[PDB]
Design an enzyme around this catalytic site. Structure first.
Site, short mmCIF file in Angstrom:
data_model
loop_
_atom_site.label_atom_id
_atom_site.label_comp_id
_atom_site.label_asym_id
_atom_site.label_seq_id
_atom_site.Cartn_x
_atom_site.Cartn_y
_atom_site.Cartn_z
N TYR A 9 0.86 -1.18 0.00
CA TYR A 9 0.00 0.00 0.00
C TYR A 9 0.89 1.23 0.00
O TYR A 9 1.12 1.84 -1.05
CB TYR A 9 -0.96 -0.03 1.19
CG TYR A 9 -1.95 1.11 1.25
CD1 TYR A 9 -3.08 1.13 0.43
CD2 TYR A 9 -1.76 2.17 2.12
CE1 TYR A 9 -3.99 2.18 0.50
CE2 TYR A 9 -2.66 3.22 2.19
CZ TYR A 9 -3.77 3.22 1.38
OH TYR A 9 -4.65 4.28 1.46
N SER B 26 -6.31 1.21 -4.27
CA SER B 26 -6.44 2.61 -3.89
C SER B 26 -5.10 3.32 -4.01
O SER B 26 -4.53 3.40 -5.10
CB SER B 26 -7.06 2.72 -2.50
OG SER B 26 -7.55 4.01 -2.27
N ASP C 278 -17.53 3.89 -7.48
CA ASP C 278 -16.40 4.23 -6.62
C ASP C 278 -16.26 5.74 -6.60
O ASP C 278 -15.52 6.33 -7.39
CB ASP C 278 -15.10 3.56 -7.06
CG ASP C 278 -13.96 3.82 -6.08
OD1 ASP C 278 -14.14 4.66 -5.16
OD2 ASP C 278 -12.89 3.18 -6.20
N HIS D 294 -15.72 1.63 -3.96
CA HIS D 294 -14.32 1.53 -3.56
C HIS D 294 -14.00 0.19 -2.90
O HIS D 294 -12.89 -0.32 -3.07
CB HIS D 294 -13.94 2.68 -2.63
CG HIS D 294 -12.47 2.94 -2.56
ND1 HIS D 294 -11.70 3.19 -3.67
CD2 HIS D 294 -11.62 2.97 -1.50
CE1 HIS D 294 -10.45 3.39 -3.31
NE2 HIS D 294 -10.37 3.25 -1.99
O1 LIG Z 1 -9.55 6.71 0.83
C1 LIG Z 1 -8.51 7.26 0.94
C2 LIG Z 1 -8.00 7.82 2.26
C3 LIG Z 1 -7.15 6.79 2.98
C4 LIG Z 1 -7.61 6.99 4.40
O2 LIG Z 1 -6.91 8.10 4.93
C5 LIG Z 1 -9.09 7.31 4.32
N1 LIG Z 1 -9.17 8.12 3.09
C6 LIG Z 1 -10.20 9.06 2.72
O3 LIG Z 1 -10.11 9.64 1.69
C7 LIG Z 1 -11.38 9.30 3.65
C8 LIG Z 1 -12.08 10.56 3.16
C9 LIG Z 1 -11.73 11.68 4.13
O4 LIG Z 1 -12.32 11.36 5.35
C10 LIG Z 1 -11.73 11.96 6.47
C11 LIG Z 1 -10.92 13.07 6.34
C12 LIG Z 1 -10.36 13.64 7.47
C13 LIG Z 1 -10.62 13.09 8.72
C14 LIG Z 1 -11.44 11.98 8.85
C15 LIG Z 1 -12.00 11.42 7.71
C16 LIG Z 1 -12.90 10.19 7.81
C17 LIG Z 1 -14.04 10.34 8.81
C18 LIG Z 1 -15.18 9.36 8.52
C19 LIG Z 1 -15.20 8.65 7.33
C20 LIG Z 1 -16.22 7.76 7.06
C21 LIG Z 1 -17.23 7.58 7.99
C22 LIG Z 1 -17.22 8.28 9.18
C23 LIG Z 1 -16.20 9.17 9.45
N2 LIG Z 1 -7.67 7.44 -0.21
C24 LIG Z 1 -8.01 6.97 -1.53
C25 LIG Z 1 -6.83 6.95 -2.50
S1 LIG Z 1 -5.41 7.35 -1.47
C26 LIG Z 1 -6.39 8.11 -0.16
#
Ligand SMILES: O=C([C@@H]1C[C@@H](O)CN1C(=O)CCCOc1ccccc1/C=C/c1ccccc1)N1CCSC1
Length: 704
Positions: free
Chosen positions: A470, A551, A635, A674
């Site tokens: 990853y 991802s 996604d 996703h």
């Molecule tokens: O998916 C991902 C990355 C990897 C991992 O960091 C998660 N992530 C996201 O993008 C999650 C979307 C942003 O969410 C947040 C932003 C700031 C703080 C908290 C959250 C999440 C709270 C929450 C989420 C769901 C339910 C309840 C609460 N990537 C894809 C390609 S590389 C990155």
């Protein structure tokens, strides 16, 4: 000998800080056009017959299904007189939430997501019981989208309430202790569709409060930051009910601002924007709420502690000069999480050389009292509230689907008991073993790698390898159970390797930062060095290596095939980020600039242009490995245009090549996203396609 779909080339030149960058498939960013739909259909009409032509596909699917077919359980969670737990009879598309009045009582179905969709494409996403355990809030997602609808049930009866909250995404779910409603997050209305097929950016997330027994139109907007459209407002109610803890994030780094609202001192019920007090007004460090005793709050933090620690902040004297360390940072192990149980005890979970350990500490002093013994593996489930006197936790490893332990917390010794053992039926795991090695990367850093294989293997270079990585976002890749991995090892002569490359969280924030932003290339160097190690030590040869990631791990695969096509025979990139110049323009991609930077910045662009997979496809003396891209049309985490544009450009690049014989293909699923909540049937089909592609491209041999 492959004929790839037509894809119109539409020259579009854009200037990035003086650098001209040309792309030809931006029309694929529109998911709704007939031209894009025709491209998707044509790619599926090419890949599906190729995957279905694998002569062992039926045996492979049958064996994955058989290995997968065992009853599964989550930890039981106590809520009043009842325990609640998830159960899968073996192959159900979604697990079912059961309730039972005590551990020895007859259980009954409380919530069955399978009853909501004929193909299992409705999944749970977030749950929360009220503090009196009389109500249950839960999120539902359709077709794998991040979008959520929050619904409510009476507990334990399971009777449905009418309350329905729409436009929820990335949401808190925090009940007030008056049992009158909960805090949640939602986005205001937007142009176009909101079903998971759109690419529209999500900004200006709001915090709302919904009162039970009202329509969502009556919900109260309690917090918003319109001058900071990327801020996301986490909400949790303190263990005593008095305080709303607001943990504000911007991007994906493990840092947050920390504000609070004194709910009991308000002169009115929750009616509008709440007045908060700022405890931490910057993004320098993480402050993750553990528990509070009155005004004294315990937080996990990485403040001057890259391996994490616990601190106490008293809201009655909140200046940083008054903060106190409760549990010191460890010299070597990462503190992953902490939980308060039985009033004044803490369960602390550490990661030590990519394996989990559990300890009991006292809340008053922070001192360590005991270790809870574990085999080599991961802790993947936990239950244990401050108000209750026992914990449950679930352990998993490469050859162990699950062990659930129960531990009474009422005395000064801690003797966990095995509560449940989850095993594959009729499979001798003792024929296989896992080793941990540490291999040198280009700069000299030693990188951990797990290698799972059959006992008695000799290092003659003959074994096909599945090499997984990853490498980002502070995510540690720890041991876990995979049914398809067992089939690979048992029937396809496989060796499975996981490289704990930098960018992850395995050794704390310094491990993460060594693989992000300007250091992102270190991640790809680490992964390439992992393949070199397996070749040099004669586990395998380059032609027999399949690399796989999802991802951010799909980016890993894309960059590695561009940079070292000679090191791999096959590559499977799932739901990958592949246009590194435009990822931040869609859905939640703006949050990833904390790991990637942004092409909007001159300095960041110079970094990104060197590795952005869409912009670095070049034919080499060695042909590219066979490539399978997997994505879903819902996604909305990583919009599928990433895979679509990469597929169009890579097929065009090799259209007239005499040397490129390996196929470059994509499979775009319907009614999936996703990955979270994907129904079992689709998961097994995807795993079957992955190993079918490998069988057809790297010459695997099936043994019954
Ligand atoms: O998916 C991902 C990355 C990897 C991992 O960091 C998660 N992530 C996201 O993008 C999650 C979307 C942003 O969410 C947040 C932003 C700031 C703080 C908290 C959250 C999440 C709270 C929450 C989420 C769901 C339910 C309840 C609460 N990537 C894809 C390609 S590389 C990155």
């Amino acid at each position: 000998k492959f004929t790839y779909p037509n894809a119109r080339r539409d020259e579009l030149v854009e200037d990035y800080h003086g650098t001209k960058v040309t792309e030809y498939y931006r029309w694929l960013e529109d998911p709704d056009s007939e031209e894009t739909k025709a491209f998707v259909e044509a790619q599926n009409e090419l890949s599906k017959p190729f995957l279905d032509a694998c002569p062992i596909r039926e045996k492979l699917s049958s064996r994955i299904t058989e290995v997968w077919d065992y009853p599964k359980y989550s930890c039981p969670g106590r809520h009043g007189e009842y325990f609640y737990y998830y159960h899968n009879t073996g192959l159900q598309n979604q697990s079912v939430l059961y309730a039972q009045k005590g551990l020895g009582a007859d259980p009954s179905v409380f919530l069955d997501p399978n009853s909501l969709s004929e193909d299992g494409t409705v999944s749970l996403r977030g749950t929360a019981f009220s503090e009196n355990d009389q109500f249950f809030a839960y999120g539902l997602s359709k077709s794998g989208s991040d979008w959520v609808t929050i619904k409510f049930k009476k507990a334990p009866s399971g009777e449905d309430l009418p309350d329905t909250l729409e436009r929820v995404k990335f949401s808190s779910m925090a009940w007030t202790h008056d049992h009158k409603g909960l805090f949640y997050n939602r986005y205001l209305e937007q142009q176009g569709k909101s079903d998971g097929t759109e690419t529209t950016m999500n900004v200006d997330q709001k915090l709302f409060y919904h009162r039970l027994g009202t329509d969502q139109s009556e919900d109260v907007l309690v917090a918003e930051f319109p001058e900071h459209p990327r801020w996301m407002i986490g909400a949790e109610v303190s263990d005593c009910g008095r305080y709303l803890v607001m943990t504000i994030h911007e991007g994906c780094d493990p840092v947050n601002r920390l504000y609070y609202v004194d709910l009991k001192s308000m002169q009115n019920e929750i009616r509008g924007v709440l007045s908060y007090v700022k405890i931490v007004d910057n993004f320098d460090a993480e402050y993750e709420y553990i528990t509070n005793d009155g005004s004294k709050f315990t937080f996990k933090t990485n403040l001057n502690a890259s391996r994490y620690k616990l601190i106490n902040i008293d809201f009655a004297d909140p200046d940083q000069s008054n903060w106190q360390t409760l549990v010191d940072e460890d010299e070597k192990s990462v503190l992953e999480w902490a939980a308060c149980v039985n009033k004044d005890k803490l369960i602390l979970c550490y990661l030590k050389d990519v394996k989990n350990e559990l300890y009991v500490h006292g809340l008053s002093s922070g001192s360590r009292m005991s270790q809870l013994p574990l085999e080599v593996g991961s802790v993947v489930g936990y239950s244990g509230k401050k108000k209750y006197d026992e914990i449950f936790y679930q352990f998993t490893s490469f050859l162990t689907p699950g062990i659930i332990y129960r531990c009474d917390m009422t005395t000064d010794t801690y003797t966990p008991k095995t509560f449940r053992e989850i095993k594959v039926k009729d499979f001798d795991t003792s024929q296989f073993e896992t080793e941990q090695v540490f291999f040198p990367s280009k700069d000299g850093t030693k990188i951990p790698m797990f290698i799972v294989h059959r006992k008695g293997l000799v290092h003659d270079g003959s074994h096909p390898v599945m090499l997984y990585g990853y490498g980002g976002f502070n995510i540690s890749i720890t041991p876990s159970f995979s049914p398809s991995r067992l089939v690979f090892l048992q029937h396809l002569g496989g060796v499975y390797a996981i490289a704990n490359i930098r960018g992850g969280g395995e050794y704390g924030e310094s491990w993460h930062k060594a693989g992000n932003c300007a250091n992102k290339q270190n991640v790809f160097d680490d992964f390439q060095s992992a393949a070199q190690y397996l070749i040099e030590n004669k586990w395998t040869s380059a032609k027999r290596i399949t690399i796989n990631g999802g991802s951010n791990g799909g980016l890993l695969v894309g960059a590695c095939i561009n940079q070292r096509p000679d090191l791999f025979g096959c590559a499977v990139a799932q739901v990958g980020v592949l246009d590194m110049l435009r990822f931040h323009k869609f859905t939640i991609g703006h949050a990833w600039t904390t790991d990637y930077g942004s092409s909007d910045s001159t300095d960041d662009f110079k970094v990104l242009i060197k590795y952005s997979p869409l912009h670095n496809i070049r034919e080499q003396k060695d042909q590219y490995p066979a490539l399978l891209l997997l994505t879903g049309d819902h996604d909305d985490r990583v919009v599928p245009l990433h895979s679509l544009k990469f597929l169009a450009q890579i097929q065009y690049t090799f259209k007239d090549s005499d040397s490129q014989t390996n196929p470059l293909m994509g499979r775009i699923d319907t009614k999936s996203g996703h990955g979270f909540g994907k129904p079992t049937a689709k998961v097994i089909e995807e795993l079957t396609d992955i190993y079918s592609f490998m069988h057809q491209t790297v010459g695997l041999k099936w043994s019954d």
